[PDB]
Design an enzyme around this catalytic site. Sequence first.
Site, PDB file in Angstrom:
ATOM      1  N   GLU A  58     -10.555  -0.350  -4.722  1.00  0.00           N
ATOM      2  CA  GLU A  58      -9.835  -1.054  -5.769  1.00  0.00           C
ATOM      3  C   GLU A  58     -10.325  -0.916  -7.199  1.00  0.00           C
ATOM      4  OE1 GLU A  58      -7.307  -2.072  -3.726  1.00  0.00           O
ATOM      5  OE2 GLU A  58      -6.235  -1.726  -5.629  1.00  0.00           O
ATOM      6  N   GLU A 108      -3.925   4.910  -1.518  1.00  0.00           N
ATOM      7  CA  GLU A 108      -2.857   4.074  -0.990  1.00  0.00           C
ATOM      8  C   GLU A 108      -2.373   4.563   0.373  1.00  0.00           C
ATOM      9  OE1 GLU A 108      -3.177   1.496  -2.274  1.00  0.00           O
ATOM     10  OE2 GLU A 108      -3.261   1.559  -4.461  1.00  0.00           O
ATOM     11  N   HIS A 112      -8.546   1.729  -9.063  1.00  0.00           N
ATOM     12  CA  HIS A 112      -7.175   1.388  -9.320  1.00  0.00           C
ATOM     13  C   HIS A 112      -7.085   0.524 -10.570  1.00  0.00           C
ATOM     14  CE1 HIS A 112      -6.260   2.096  -4.817  1.00  0.00           C
ATOM     15  NE2 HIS A 112      -7.000   3.076  -5.350  1.00  0.00           N
ATOM     16  N   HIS A 145      -4.955   3.123   2.596  1.00  0.00           N
ATOM     17  CA  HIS A 145      -4.668   1.691   2.781  1.00  0.00           C
ATOM     18  C   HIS A 145      -3.476   1.403   3.684  1.00  0.00           C
ATOM     19  CE1 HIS A 145      -6.981   0.898  -1.139  1.00  0.00           C
ATOM     20  NE2 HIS A 145      -7.740   1.490  -0.204  1.00  0.00           N
ATOM     21  N   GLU A 165       0.860  -1.167   0.000  1.00  0.00           N
ATOM     22  CA  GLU A 165       0.000   0.000   0.000  1.00  0.00           C
ATOM     23  C   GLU A 165       0.909   1.233   0.000  1.00  0.00           C
ATOM     24  OE1 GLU A 165      -2.981  -0.767  -0.523  1.00  0.00           O
ATOM     25  OE2 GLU A 165      -3.473  -2.563   0.612  1.00  0.00           O
ATOM     26  N   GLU A 173      -2.490  -5.653  -8.693  1.00  0.00           N
ATOM     27  CA  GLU A 173      -3.831  -5.431  -8.189  1.00  0.00           C
ATOM     28  C   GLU A 173      -4.897  -6.274  -8.889  1.00  0.00           C
ATOM     29  OE1 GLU A 173      -3.539  -1.059  -8.570  1.00  0.00           O
ATOM     30  OE2 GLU A 173      -3.695  -0.877  -6.399  1.00  0.00           O
TER      31      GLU A 173
HETATM   32 FE   LIG Z   1      -4.299  -0.350  -1.910  1.00  0.00          FE
HETATM   33 FE   LIG Z   2      -4.811  -0.407  -5.006  1.00  0.00          FE
END
Ligand SMILES: [Fe+3]
Ligand SMILES: [Fe+3]
Lengths: 384, 384, 512, 512, 162
Positions: free
Chosen positions: D229, D130, D232, D133, D100, D195
């Site tokens: 997510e 991030e 991302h 996270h 992360e 990811e």
């Molecule tokens: Fe993440």
């Molecule tokens: Fe991510």
Amino acid sequence: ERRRGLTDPEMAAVILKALPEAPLDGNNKMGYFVTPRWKRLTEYEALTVYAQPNADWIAGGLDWGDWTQKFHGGRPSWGNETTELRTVDWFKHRDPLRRWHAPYVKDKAEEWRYTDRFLQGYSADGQIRAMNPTWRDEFINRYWGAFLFNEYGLFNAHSQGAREALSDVTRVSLAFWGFDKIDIAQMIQLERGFLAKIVPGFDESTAVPKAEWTNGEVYKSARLAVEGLWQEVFDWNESAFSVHAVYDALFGQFVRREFFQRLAPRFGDNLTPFFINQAQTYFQIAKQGVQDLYYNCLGDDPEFSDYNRTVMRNWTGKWLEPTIAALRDFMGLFAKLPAGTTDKEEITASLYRVVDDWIEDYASRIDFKADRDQIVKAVLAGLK
Amino acid sequence: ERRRGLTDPEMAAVILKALPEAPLDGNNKMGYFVTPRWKRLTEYEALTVYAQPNADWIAGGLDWGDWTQKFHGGRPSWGNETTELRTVDWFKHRDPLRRWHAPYVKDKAEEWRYTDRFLQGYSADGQIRAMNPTWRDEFINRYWGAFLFNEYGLFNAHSQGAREALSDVTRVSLAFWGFDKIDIAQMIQLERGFLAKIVPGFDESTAVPKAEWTNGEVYKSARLAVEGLWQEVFDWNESAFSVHAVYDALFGQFVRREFFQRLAPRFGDNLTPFFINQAQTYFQIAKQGVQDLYYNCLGDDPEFSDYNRTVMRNWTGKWLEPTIAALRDFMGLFAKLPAGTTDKEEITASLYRVVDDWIEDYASRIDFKADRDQIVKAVLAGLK
Amino acid sequence: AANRAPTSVNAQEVHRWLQSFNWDFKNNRTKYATKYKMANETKEQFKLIAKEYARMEAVKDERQFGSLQVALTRLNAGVRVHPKWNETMKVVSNFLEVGEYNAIAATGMLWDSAQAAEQKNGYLAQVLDEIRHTHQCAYVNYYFAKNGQDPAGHNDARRTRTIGPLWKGMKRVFSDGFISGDAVECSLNLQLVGEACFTNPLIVAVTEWAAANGDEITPTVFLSIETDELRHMANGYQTVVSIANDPASAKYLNTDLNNAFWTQQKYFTPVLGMLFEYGSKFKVEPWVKTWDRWVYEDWGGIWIGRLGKYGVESPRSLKDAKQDAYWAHHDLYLLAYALWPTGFFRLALPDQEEMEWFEANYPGWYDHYGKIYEEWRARGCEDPSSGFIPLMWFIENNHPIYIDRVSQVPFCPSLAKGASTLRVHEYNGEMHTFSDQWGERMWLAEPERYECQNIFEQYEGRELSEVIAELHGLRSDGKTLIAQPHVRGDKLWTLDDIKRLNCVFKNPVKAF
Amino acid sequence: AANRAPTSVNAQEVHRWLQSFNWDFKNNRTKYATKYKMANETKEQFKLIAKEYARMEAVKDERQFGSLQVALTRLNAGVRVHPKWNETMKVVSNFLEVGEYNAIAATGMLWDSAQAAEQKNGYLAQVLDEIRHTHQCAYVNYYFAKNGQDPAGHNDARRTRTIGPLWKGMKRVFSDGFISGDAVECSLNLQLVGEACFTNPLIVAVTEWAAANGDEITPTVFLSIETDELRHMANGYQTVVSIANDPASAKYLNTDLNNAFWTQQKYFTPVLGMLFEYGSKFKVEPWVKTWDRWVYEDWGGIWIGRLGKYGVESPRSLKDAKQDAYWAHHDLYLLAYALWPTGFFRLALPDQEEMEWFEANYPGWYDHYGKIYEEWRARGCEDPSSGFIPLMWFIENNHPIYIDRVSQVPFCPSLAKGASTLRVHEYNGEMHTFSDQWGERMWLAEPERYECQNIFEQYEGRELSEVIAELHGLRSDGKTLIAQPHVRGDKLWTLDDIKRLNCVFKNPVKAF
Amino acid sequence: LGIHSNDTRDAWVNKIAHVNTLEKAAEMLKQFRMDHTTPFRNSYELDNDYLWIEAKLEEKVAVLKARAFNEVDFRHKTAFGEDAKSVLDGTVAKMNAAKDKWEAEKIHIGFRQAYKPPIMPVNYFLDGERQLGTRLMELRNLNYYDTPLEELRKQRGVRVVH
Ligand SMILES: [Fe+3]
Ligand SMILES: [Fe+3]
Ligand SMILES: [Fe+3]
Ligand SMILES: [Fe+3]
């Protein structure tokens, strides 16, 4: 249906049976090994300090050995080579406001929803009725709108820093400094979008203020400084320090506080100040972190204070000239104001407030000998 | 120690064994019997409507029989006798903003925390420096300070309604209308408290503004009207209606929006507008609920429309005179302003904004024939 | 940039000047009749302003709603609760809801009574807190309705509660007792007695019983409600302080206090113990012990003792309340169960383990109630094809059930293990039935305050099923009753099952 | 009163003009080396502005922290988790934490690379995500340390992680691979492969196994992480879309993709299978099944297939990856356990049921791994008084353990049921050990990118207890090891137990 | 001795403490880089400690450079007195004239060993990383898998021990 171990009689009984009688270690404090900045370790620190996997060869790192995969050519993932500044420990920095992700988005979200209610109130209240049309149509739309690009450039100046910062505490502060800048750029457009909704004929297209930014005279040197700070600087600290402790501290503060915040009120405009309030709140918040990193940690570093101050004074000089040039071209905007809006006396006092604040808050911190009169006189040279 | 039935193997086993195969009723919607105002039942409605235990003898009540304990003499706990207004169902009202306790405090908390940050930013930014000392020391301190008593009186006017309201939906709106008023009074004091901290010698004591309210000329009729609305009205609806749809809609809107919000900016004061923004946002939020109750529900009642409008017109006439007297005395404040601050043309324009706004939003909804010129001229008589 | 340190202003700095907000004018006085005078310099304990109040509560709400929406829902916490407790919460949350609701109006009345701005401010925080509590209790019913094992009743208690007799008594202590009378008497019913003696300790107790019975929803909400209660007790204490230095206090305070104490205990003594002991599977503590600790010790002893310096004395009716307490909850459950078709919830007869538990903690329980429950079960009270409702047993055994004209509490003097008092009076063409000396004086001295029509008076001559149907006491299928004499998922009673019994209400007083 | 409808402006209405924010100047170009050209004019999927981004995340935080702080704490959820899982979460949360973290820097790099404002904006939101996270994973360890059965390791993983070999490999896939190389290669490692192929399914699977093992803390946090997510994935897709219409794409994209794919799977294939199967009591699904669905079907087939229109094709090393997979995690746990004194977590030998589960799902498991574990137990690997560390068995049986110079994954060729390949080269006075043909090519082609010192090179000639001591591998009593060869509450090994074994590291390549 | 503190690290901070001129410090740092860094290093004897030792040497060079140079020179001249921009440009020009990936890696790797900050100013150096890395990758990543490993091992020049 799924059976969960916490509530399923069978699975829970198996779990409970395996548990020890008491915890296997009494030390229940996560980052207990982190040197707290304050009386007791904070959550902000526990959740942030040492997240960055630096080895001991990057000052303050707790790991060992080289990175596992480097760039083609050999450049390290993170390395001392990415900035001129040196320190005994890159993890020393602390945002005085202790912002980790949660409190940061919490506050920004409050500002967002209150912004929505305020606009809903302002429009319902018909407060637009007494706003001067010339101010709204020329000054807010074109000139304040043009400033969006300044903040956007300042935002973008942070991209390399997000990648190169040498510690978690510095990376988090840096990202928030940059995110607040794009927010401000977006709030300038949001205001224009709002005017387009409540004022017939008002065009929210960025075409006009963009053309003002890219080709106008008032923001010429401003744009040149921004393009420089963003794309000609490859040192993440030079970028952060020069943007926040030189350029924005002088030019940005003058434009936001001494021009728009000071003058919009004279034109029945409480709309623009609502957003500048956010910009100034954000400026003052970042300042605390900028000062902690550059002065408390770097400029006052126990082993590299002299060195760092030499480098920072160097950057100050390097960026002070284009900053003055930026202010100088901006003086041209006063000539465009309706007769009687301001006078040289008020402009001069406002210039001194910005310079004096910058000297006390930044320049003096690294022993940079700024000459207030010399700076103000140079800027005044551009009045018309 | 404490074993919990949801996680304890033995206890959960017992609970699980007693559970039915599927729910004993497929109608899993609390409040399903409430008539939705909008497309589908909202959380606001489900959690609020019919919480008040009224019997069928108070329009719209679902219960039966007398109250179990009444006042000495026999007055009912709640009854039709506490207000002149009549309706087919006291539960019809819906706050258009749908606020139950959770969203109401969420929004106010955001405003409180952002206010704190704004103040931290303003003081750190040195923004007071350009604020006119006379406006600061005389107008904010004494005159705006005095207005706190007006809002406080208006807040207090709500006490009886909190006790006498005939439905949950009206009670919740009513309490929130009153709670915002006390909030505004406190925000006026908060500003004076802030000024005392950043301006040497500024006195936050309420003695000065209180003496202005209790003894000055400018707010005399205002205070008289407030004292009457609060203590001389025993009808909870007359109180809420006359406070929000007559007095505060005319006098309050003039003082907040047409005097202070309009003029404070001309004296380099962005501080007062920060708080007035809250007051105006609150006023506009309350307006929607006031309009729904008094016009959509009562004034447009399928059975009592004509009756309720007759009563509301009666109250408008009753309270319009003391409201005009309030505005008339307030006109005296213009003569105390520095020469060149504003003029009769701006003042007249501002009065017409307030009056026209009032006619559109309130007076016309009940067919009350207001003469805009008669009202403005009657007010301007206290100017010159 | 800067020039001056970042500064702000907090609640207390603004509160310092709040007392001065109120000003003098001839008609600045309360709009409500009262024998007392609240001193105009009365201060409040919590130095709050509207903004800070909102923030305090907002933080609590995010925690609570986060738990409910996230983890508890993922855990299916709305379902994994003992059936009996699911039912108990229909009553506990909705009945408490009306208390929170009327408390809003009560504090509005108190805010109007208080002359000191600070005292008004304290009452005002409570006005908002009780609005918070109303939506909180509502949310508990809403959550169990949405996610639980039996939504009926949880989903419409605001209208289905009107069918039964227990609701009438609830309105006396938590609705009318809070808002009808001298503002001070209302404050004693609400704050000094209601919250300080019953609600405050009750809310916490509810979370313990709920937790024992697999309910994690109620703890999450009720524990949040509890955080606001200390401000309210401070309000009650302040009410006494504000009126104590005036001549009227010595003449009237202890009487209003005594009347308020008896009023609250009359309902809660039998009802709370009933909801806890008979409404649960797993038991936390026998009610006899709890009652003694809460009422005699904590409240009547310590809490009340703190008010002694203001001339407050333990209620003169305390010993009488203890005397009548012992069997009160047991006596009442017989009645609630006998009248099960009038509720909006499902009731169960005690199982074998519970019967053992009852006899162990209440010697003599079995030969009286145990025998009755066993006889009722033998008669098929749980079976829809039996043709038997316990009300029939009372009629067959000559045990009239009456409703106290004052408290609305149902009582059966001829069968009761507890109090057997019964006073019947005729006045101006109407008869009135009383169950105790205190309520009798209340009616005799204030007949016009107590005219509440009872269920036998309203339902006189009506067949049971017609009453249940008219008042919407059915499930969504429009056939099955919401109320049941068992908590099993099968063999649920039907409207036709009740109609077939041909039970027609009779006003018991017509026998005199 | 007033006139005009209440109006405001939303995110989309502002975002509509965001592309126009960037302007032309000669040096407006990326600061990072790249073979590609990200098209200006590239658009983003999510029309976000900073304020709306904060609001959407704040609401999630509210729910999450509410659950953690209220109900889960009241449920003692930090304690009632299987001992094995408490240990696994030290590694899962802290190792994910570094990914992360490095992902913040990676997206800063990508933000720099992108020339279109919208593309930069898309990467920017991920930069902020991030950070979120990083703090979330940090919070999971913080919570387990604060409220769990064994805080050691959970409380200091940021420094204790450095003692062991598994951490080096984690830095390759989730730290260096994310930020060191052509920005596009990093994006492939991070988004397109990392990811989309591993993290996205892993995060949800982790909540599955956690729940099975009594852990409700991890699902609360990880399910909140997974909600971000999607954005991302969009960033990764956008990376390809942005460079696809340039001549460089045809020349380089697929080899950067293949190299990134090999890089990610090389670590995750054995490591995640190991963490799931050997770090849990209750199992959810055999890893062989999971890996095939995740990598071969979901990603390798469907996900990548959606990028075919941009010239992306299935990694040429996919076949090799599947072949090497089957026994990979089993082979690795032998080494992880053999090297238990170097960890910051406690490990257990599989119990009888697990051995049966393993054999049922992986025929031949018992003959190889099962017998070995039984031999180690007989030798006394769980007992402090034995003077036995499994590493001793490796030495006695001539089974050298090597560290791949490129991936850092430990491997034992002579024992492994998997790959068994080993390539050893000497170059300019240093020897290098490789475990596969893909990493070998990476080093041969880019030797200056892979100079990472391995555990045996750094610890060469050092006695084990001194390494553990200097690196703080002890619990608060300053003598008991954080790591353990069993998960029971007593018979915990101490520094002195390790010292008496006199285990001195040797660089295995020196045998050549 | 330890991982983070040991005899060799000790020996090196003592030697670094003796440098008293920018030229001797810069020379020692450059020589250190040729001797102990990259796959082309003259020796692997300091493999476990060179990364940290290099950083200590860099500190000394940095400090001496800031004292010695005027402001413009601190920004534009290398520690050895060369014009950074001229070196940057000439190096990139050589890289762009590289005829294959083998010549290319030597140019990039060598540039790092000789000019890594505090020798060349960071602004110029990272601009070099940007330009040099691009060409190195363009050359290396073209037809990346065409050469069989047996031949690639010979091109690299490894002694295959297996
Ligand atoms: Fe993440
Ligand atoms: Fe991510
Ligand atoms: Fe309450
Ligand atoms: Fe209360």
